C-alpha cells in the first residue's frame, strides 16, 4: 500500500532529542515517543494550528474511529 | 467596519484511488480543477458545461439567490439507461418524473444517497456494465475495500 506508515510511538519514560536541534522539525513536536510532559498541536505563524504529516485533525480522527480507514 | 460574507461553499480535493482520481465518498464530483468536490450540501452553479449551468452533472437548482448555493448536492437526472428512464440501481427515484413537478423539484430526481461518487454496475445490456451515464472505474466485487464498481460522475 502506497502509504508511509510509520512505526509505533508509545509513551516512553525518558526524554530524547532528535539530533536535529538547529532545524526544529514539526513531526517531532507531536511525537510522544520523545517528549514526556504535555501534548499540543503545533502552532505555525500567527498562532495557526499547523497539522504535521502523519497526524490528523480531531474531525479526521473521529471519521477514522467511526466510519473507518482506507487502503 | 468589516465586510460581511456569503455562503462560502466548502470544497475538498479529489483523491487517488489507484490508477485514477475521483472525489471522496461523502462528497460529489463537482465541476473541475479549482472546485473538484462539494462538501457542503449546496454549491456554486459551476459555469463550465458541455457550456451551461446544470448543475453541473450531479447537483440540481434550488430556489435561491447567492449563486454559491444555488445547486443542491446529491442529485442527477432521469439519465436514460438502455430503453427506460430509470435511475442507477444505487440511486433512489424520487418520483418527480418532470411533468408532475415544478422546475426546481423536476430536476431533483434521483437522491444519490450514500452513492455520491461511486455506484454499482447494472444488468442492463446483459453484461453487468458501467451505467450508461458514468465513467468505467476498474473495480470489481472480488476487489476488497472498494465496493464501488465501474462508476464515476
Amino acid at each position: 500500500p502506497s502509504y508511509q506508515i510509520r512505526n509505533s510511538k508509545h509513551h516512553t519514560q525518558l526524554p530524547m532529542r532528535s539530533l536535529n536541534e538547529p532545524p526544529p522539525m514539526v513531526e517531532d513536536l507531536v511525537d510522544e515517543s520523545l517528549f514526556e510532559g504535555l501534548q499540543g498541536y503545533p502552532v505555525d505563524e500567527k498562532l495557526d494550528l499547523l497539522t504535521p504529516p502523519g497526524t490528523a485533525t480531531p474531525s479526521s480522527e473521529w471519521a477514522a474511529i467511526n466510519y473507518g480507514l482506507t487502503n | 467596519v468589516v465586510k460581511p460574507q456569503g455562503y462560502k461553499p466548502e470544497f475538498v480535493n479529489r483523491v487517488n484511488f489507484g490508477k485514477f482520481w475521483a472525489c471522496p465518498e461523502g462528497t460529489t464530483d463537482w465541476g473541475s480543477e479549482d472546485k473538484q468536490c462539494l462538501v457542503s450540501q449546496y454549491g456554486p452553479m459551476m459555469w463550465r458545461n458541455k457550456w451551461g449551468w446544470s448543475c453541473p452533472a450531479g447537483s440540481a437548482p434550488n430556489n435561491s439567490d447567492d449563486w454559491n448555493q444555488k445547486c443542491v448536492q446529491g442529485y442527477s437526472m432521469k439519465k436514460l439507461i438502455d430503453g427506460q428512464w430509470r435511475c442507477t440501481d444505487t440511486e433512489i427515484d424520487t418520483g418527480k418524473d418532470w411533468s408532475n413537478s415544478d422546475w426546481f423539484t423536476a430536476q431533483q430526481q434521483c437522491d444519490r444517497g450514500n452513492n455520491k461518487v461511486f455506484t454499482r454496475r447494472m444488468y442492463i445490456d446483459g453484461k453487468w456494465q458501467c451505467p450508461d451515464g458514468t465513467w468505467d472505474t476498474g473495480f470489481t466485487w472480488s476487489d476488497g475495500e472498494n465496493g464501488g464498481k465501474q462508476c464515476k460522475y
Binding site: L19, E21, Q39, V43, K46, P58, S59, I65 | -
Partner: protein, 434 residues
C-alpha cells in the same frame, strides 16, 4: 577502568542500539508554548441547595477556555467514624453537561465511584478519598468541606478545554442533582438523622486566559474536539441463590465507538457496596464480633478486594450473538483486565472489559462501534449464594463458584460504556456531530 571500560567496549550487537544514532538523552529541548493563565472562579448556583434538590449553574464567560471543575460541599457527620463512605460523591447524585441546550454527557454518583474504583490508584485514589470523605476517624458533628472534581473530558485535560470564547451565542451549563439521602450525613441506613445539616454547595471552574493572538484565533475559527461520553443504563440483576447459578442475557444498548465497558453489581441501599456482607473483618457492620450483622456494611469500609463476596462467576460479551472473546471468570474482569489496561487495583464487585489498548488515555486505541452491532449483549453467570455469611470458616475457607448468602442483596446492575464523539464549534455555536 570505570565507566570508560564499558563505553569503549563497542561490539557488533551495539550497532542496533547506538550506531548512526538518532537521539540523545543528555540535552532536552523544551517546546515553547503560548501564554496562558489559570484562574479559579466561583459560579452562581441557581435553585435551592439541599438534599434531594436539583440545582444548576451556567458557566460564566470569564476566561477563554475551561477545564477543571470542582464542586464543593460542606457536610456534617450524622454519626461517628465508620458511618460514611465517600459522602460527597454520594451526594452529588448526578451531573449533566449541556452546551447550546444540547445534552453532551451525564455522570452519576455511582459512575464516579465506579470510575474511581477502576481508574484511580495509589495516592491519587487516597488523596481523592480525602476530598470526598472523612478519613481521620472524625466523630459525630464533625464539619468538613469536600471537593468533588468532575471527570468530563474537558475536566481531565487542557487539550480538550472548552472554547467558551468561541461560543459567542451558546451557554455551557451543569445541572447537579443532589441525593435525597447521604449515608452517615443525613441518614443511618433507612433512619433519618434528626438535626442533620443541609449541605452548603459551591461550583468552581478553573478558567484559562489566553493571550491576544490565541484568544482571537479561538474566537474566529471553527473548532472540533474529539471527546469522551458516558453511556449508562441500570438493569435488574438476575439475582443468584443458594441452590442456583443464575444467568443473564443483558442487552447492551450502547452506540458509538466504545473504548470500554465497565460494570458492577450493587446493593442500591448502600452507596458503593459492590459486594456481599459478611462477618469477617471489614465485610460488615461490627464484623468479627458478637454485634456483627450482615444486613448492614461497615460503611467506612464498604469497599473490599475480597472477591469471595462478589457475585460474578463468569462473563462474555457477544456481538449479534457471536462471542467477542472466550468466556472468562469474574475475577478475570476484576483483576486481569485492569492489570493489563489500567495498572491499578480494582475492588471486588467492579468489572472491566476494554476494547482499547489504553482505555485511560485520550488517543483512540481500539474501539467497539456498537452503532454497527444490531444486538450486542453481555452474558453473565452468577455465583451460587450458599455461604453462611455469618461464619468466617464458611466465608474465608470456600471455593470459586460460590458466594455469601447475603450476596442476593446485590440486586442492582450498573453497566457503563465510555465512547468517543465529536464536539463541534462554529461561528459562535456548537454541539455534537451525531
Amino acid at each position: 577502568a570505570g565507566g570508560l571500560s564499558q563505553l569503549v567496549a563497542y561490539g557488533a550487537q551495539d550497532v542496533y542500539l547506538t550506531g548512526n544514532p538518532q537521539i540523545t538523552f543528555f540535552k532536552t529541548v523544551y517546546r515553547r508554548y503560548t501564554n496562558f493563565a489559570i484562574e479559579s472562579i466561583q459560579q452562581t448556583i441557581n435553585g435551592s441547595v439541599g438534599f434531594g434538590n436539583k440545582v444548576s449553574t451556567q458557566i460564566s464567560r470569564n476566561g477563554d477556555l475551561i477545564t477543571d471543575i470542582v464542586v464543593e460541599f460542606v457536610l456534617t457527620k450524622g454519626g461517628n467514624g465508620g458511618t460514611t463512605y465517600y459522602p460527597a460523591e454520594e451526594l452529588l447524585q448526578d451531573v449533566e453537561l449541556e452546551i447550546g441546550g444540547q445534552r453532551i454527557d451525564k455522570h452519576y454518583n455511582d459512575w464516579f465511584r465506579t470510575y474511581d474504583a477502576l481508574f484511580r490508584m495509589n495516592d491519587d485514589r487516597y488523596n481523592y478519598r480525602r476530598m470526598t470523605d472523612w478519613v481521620n476517624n472524625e466523630l459525630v458533628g464533625a464539619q468538613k468541606r469536600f471537593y468533588v472534581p468532575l471527570i468530563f473530558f474537558f475536566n481531565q485535560t487542557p487539550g480538550l478545554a472548552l472554547p467558551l470564547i468561541a461560543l459567542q451565542y451558546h451557554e455551557v451549563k451543569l445541572y447537579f442533582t443532589l441525593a435525597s439521602q447521604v449515608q452517615g450525613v443525613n441518614y443511618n441506613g433507612s433512619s433519618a438523622i434528626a438535626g442533620a445539616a443541609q449541605p452548603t454547595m459551591s461550583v468552581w471552574v478553573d478558567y484559562i486566559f489566553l493571550d491576544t493572538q490565541e484568544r482571537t484565533r479561538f474566537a474566529q475559527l471553527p473548532h472540533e474536539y474529539l471527546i469522551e461520553q458516558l453511556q449508562f443504563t441500570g438493569s435488574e440483576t438476575a439475582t443468584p441463590s443458594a441452590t442456583t447459578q443464575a444467568s443473564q442475557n443483558i442487552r447492551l444498548n450502547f452506540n458509538h465507538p466504545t473504548k470500554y465497558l465497565a460494570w458492577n453489581f450493587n446493593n442500591p441501599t448502600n452507596y458503593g457496596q459492590y459486594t456481599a456482607l459478611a462477618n469477617i473483618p471489614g465485610a460488615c457492620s461490627g464484623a468479627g464480633t458478637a454485634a456483627a450483622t450482615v444486613t448492614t456494611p461497615d460503611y467506612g469500609n464498604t469497599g473490599t478486594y475480597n472477591e469471595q463476596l462478589a457475585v460474578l462467576d463468569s462473563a462474555k460479551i457477544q456481538l449479534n450473538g457471536q462471542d467477542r472473546f472466550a468466556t472468562r471468570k469474574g475475577s478475570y474482569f476484576n483483576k486481569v483486565q485492569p492489570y493489563q489496561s489500567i495498572g491499578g487495583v480494582t475492588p471486588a464487585g467492579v468489572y472491566l472489559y476494554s476494547f482499547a489498548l489504553k482505555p485511560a488515555g485520550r488517543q483512540p486505541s481500539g474501539t467497539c462501534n456498537f452503532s454497527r452491532i444490531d444486538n450486542a449483549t453481555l452474558s453473565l453467570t452468577y455465583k451460587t449464594c450458599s455461604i453462611d455469611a455469618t461464619s468466617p470458616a464458611a466465608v474465608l475457607g470456600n471455593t470459586e463458584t460460590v458466594t455469601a448468602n447475603t450476596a442476593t442483596l446485590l440486586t442492582a446492575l450498573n453497566i457503563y460504556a465510555k465512547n468517543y464523539n465529536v464536539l463541534r464549534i462554529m461561528s459562535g455555536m456548537g454541539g455534537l456531530a451525531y
